[PDB]
Each structure stands twice: as structure tokens, then as C-alpha cells.
């Protein structure tokens, strides 16, 4: 598999210099929506453990927004984005990111465990207000961050263990078809459908020799809109060469060959 992730995406809003009572955290698991939390309750897009933690994080972010200077008239947003991953090697990543009016200005991850800001003049200035905010608080040690990292990963592990995340492959269904029968030639399209995960290889082959990307025509990979994807590739051949053309597919470590049906 590609890695198991968990993301918290917390947003607080200021209108004409005043921090709004409300905030929203949207939890996503392996990319998929999982929780939405307002000030009051967490709901599945019982959740006490999540409501307790995520409400706290919310309040803590209303204050940090307050310590930002020159809050220009109107609406601005501050977000705290936390993503940890557990890979197939059981190695782990974690990142904390702060975004003001949706632009990064500050980033902590587990490999450096140092804060690092962009070059953007506005960024350096926003990071300033916020790190000077964290300096003052006698109770914001390097541990506070090393704990936020550890927390993310403990939750992700809790969610894995209790089978909230399913890591099931769906191998594609394949149909080949004849089409655009015109001027003694025909189009042969090989469609792959219903499949997860996304990555897939799908080419036409004349006599086991795979065809140049320029001699074929490729569908995009579209969401089927039930969690899965679909795609296709076609090529133009002379009528009665159809028994020398096969569609080759690699997916979820199957390899398979589909010929032009008669």
C-alpha cells in the first residue's frame, strides 16, 4: 500500500478585527472525510475523545490569531494543519503547518523538529508575531510540539487497530470493444473500470510489442463517484489485423492480457 494518513484541518476566522466564537476542524483518514467538528459537537462526515481534544485545539488557535498584528479590515483565516503518516516500513512522518488567509507561514515536522518559515516578507512577519507569542508562554517547551506529533500518530494507530480504515484493493473490470468502423480501418478501445487504488498501467500491444504513447489515445482517470476510478486507451488498426492487438493491464500486482473480441 501507499501510506496510512490522518489529517486535522482546524480553521478560525476574524471579521473586521474580531475573532469569531466558532471554528471548524475537518478530520480526514487515508484521504477520506471522517469527522467534522464545530465548537459544540463532532459528527461523522459518539466522539467525546475527539470533541474534548479538537475543541481545546480550537480555543488555543483563537488566542494565537489575537496575537497577529495589523488584522486588515474584513475576513481573515488562520488554520493549523496536522498530518501524520505510517508507511509500509512502519516508519512515520508528522507535520504541523500554520496557514494565514490560506498561505503557509510556519512548518514543524518530525525529521528536522525545527520550525521553518518561507521567504515571503508577509510570512516572516506572521511567523514573528506567533513565535514571539510562543516565547512569552513560559509553558510552550519544544515538548509541546514533540507531543502534538506523537498525538497524531497515536490516534492514527488507534483508528487503524479498530478497523475504521479498510485497505482493500478493487481489481478492475476490463471490456474491449470495436468502434469507428470507417475507411477500411477500425478503432479498438480497452476500458478499465471500478478500480482502486488509482495507479494503473494500460497499453495496447501489437504482437506482444507495446505501442508508442503517440500511436494510442488515452482517457483521463475519472472518479467513478463510488470511491473507485475508471480509464481507457484506444488505438486505430486495419480491419483483419485485430487478432494481433491485445490490451495489457498491470494493477494490484496482477498482469493480464485482453484481446479484441470477434
Amino acid at each position: 500500500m501507499e501510506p496510512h494518513s490522518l489529517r486535522y484541518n482546524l480553521t478560525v476566522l476574524i471579521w473586521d478585527g474580531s475573532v469569531q466564537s466558532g471554528f471548524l476542524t475537518e478530520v480526514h483518514l487515508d484521504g477520506q472525510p471522517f469527522l467534522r467538528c464545530d465548537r459544540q459537537k463532532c459528527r461523522a462526515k459518539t466522539w467525546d475523545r475527539e470533541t474534548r481534544d479538537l475543541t481545546g485545539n480550537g480555543k488555543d488557535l483563537r488566542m494565537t490569531l489575537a496575537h497577529i498584528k495589523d488584522q486588515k479590515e474584513g475576513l481573515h483565516s488562520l488554520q493549523e494543519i496536522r498530518v501524520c503518516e505510517i508507511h509500509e516500513d512502519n516508519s512515520t512522518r508528522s507535520s504541523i503547518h500554520f496557514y494565514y488567509d490560506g498561505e503557509l507561514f510556519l512548518s514543524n515536522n518530525l525529521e528536522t523538529k525545527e520550525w521553518t518559515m518561507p521567504q515571503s516578507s508577509r510570512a516572516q512577519t506572521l511567523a514573528m508575531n506567533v513565535r514571539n507569542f510562543w516565547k512569552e508562554d513560559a509553558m510552550k517547551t519544544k515538548t509541546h510540539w514533540h507531543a502534538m506529533h506523537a498525538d497524531c500518530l497515536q490516534e492514527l494507530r488507534r483508528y487503524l487497530k479498530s478497523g475504521v480504515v479498510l485497505r482493500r484493493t478493487v481489481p478492475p473490470m476490463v471490456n474491449v470493444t470495436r468502434s469507428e468502423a470507417s475507411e477500411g480501418n477500425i478503432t479498438v478501445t480497452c476500458r478499465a473500470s471500478g478500480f482502486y487504488p488509482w495507479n494503473i498501467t494500460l497499453s495496447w500491444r501489437q504482437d506482444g510489442v507495446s505501442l508508442s504513447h503517440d500511436t494510442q489515445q488515452w482517457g483521463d482517470v475519472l472518479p467513478d463517484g463510488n470511491g473507485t476510478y475508471q480509464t481507457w486507451v484506444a488505438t486505430r488498426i486495419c480491419q483483419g489485423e485485430e487478432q494481433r492487438f491485445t490490451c495489457y493491464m498491470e494493477h494490484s500486482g496482477n498482469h493480464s492480457t485482453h484481446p479484441v473480441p470477434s
Binding site: 478585527g17 466564537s21 480555543k59 483563537r62 488566542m63 489575537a66 513560559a138 509553558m139
Partner: protein, 123 residues
């Protein structure tokens, strides 16, 4: 003194003051009233030294501070003015009440917004 008091049964004693923390969130007036219903008041901050435990308080919580826009400054529910160099008041929300946060900070909040509160009985 090996002994601290006197305090309501299941309350926190620190240096002959009593403190309780209430999870069940309420607006500023609802909170004042909940404090008043235990011959208590909302947290008043008079001393960094006698109330140094307050540095270790997580999150934010209603205290008895209230704006008086006539002169333009803060006073406690009992009536006494804000000793300068005790709290730093940070403008957060537009309102006329303040949440206490660590360490010796007040955030201005709209009095109508439900928040957790801290009650205090003094000497």
C-alpha cells in the same frame, strides 16, 4: 501552616483562597449567577504571588472582569478596579467581558458566548 482553609467541601485550597472549575459552559451572566449560588464569585486576580498556581491553568475561562466604557477601563464584579501590571488584556472578540488565560492574560470575549468558568472564595 500544615492546614489550608476554610473551603467548600470538594473545592481547591491554595494559600487561603478556594477555587472550582466548571466544565458545563455558560455565558458571562449565567456564570456569575452559578458562582453566586455557592456564596462565591467569578475568579478575581489580585496577586501574581498568592495566585501563582494560575500559571498552570490550561485553556480559557470566565473571570469577574467587566469593561466600563464611561471612563474606559476594567473592574471586578465586587467593584474594585484592575491593579495595573497584573493582567495583560488582549483584544480578541468584541465584547465587554474577559476570559482568563495562562499566564496572567485576559482575552476580551462577547459576554453572550458560552465558555467554562472559574469560581473563587477569598480571605
Amino acid at each position: 501552616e500544615s492546614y489550608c482553609g476554610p473551603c467548600p467541601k470538594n473545592w481547591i485550597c491554595y494559600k487561603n483562597n478556594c477555587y472550582q472549575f466548571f466544565d458545563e459552559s455558560k455565558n458571562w451572566y449565567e456564570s456569575q449567577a452559578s458562582c453566586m449560588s455557592q456564596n462565591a464569585s467569578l475568579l478575581k486576580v489580585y496577586s501574581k504571588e498568592d495566585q501563582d498556581l494560575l500559571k498552570l491553568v490550561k485553556s480559557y475561562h470566565w473571570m469577574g472582569l467587566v469593561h466600563i466604557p464611561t471612563n474606559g477601563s476594567w473592574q471586578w464584579e465586587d467593584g474594585s478596579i484592575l491593579s495595573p501590571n497584573l493582567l495583560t488584556i488582549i483584544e480578541m472578540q468584541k465584547g465587554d467581558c474577559a476570559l482568563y488565560a495562562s499566564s496572567f492574560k485576559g482575552y476580551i470575549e462577547n459576554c453572550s458566548t458560552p465558555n467554562t468558568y472559574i469560581c473563587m472564595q477569598r480571605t
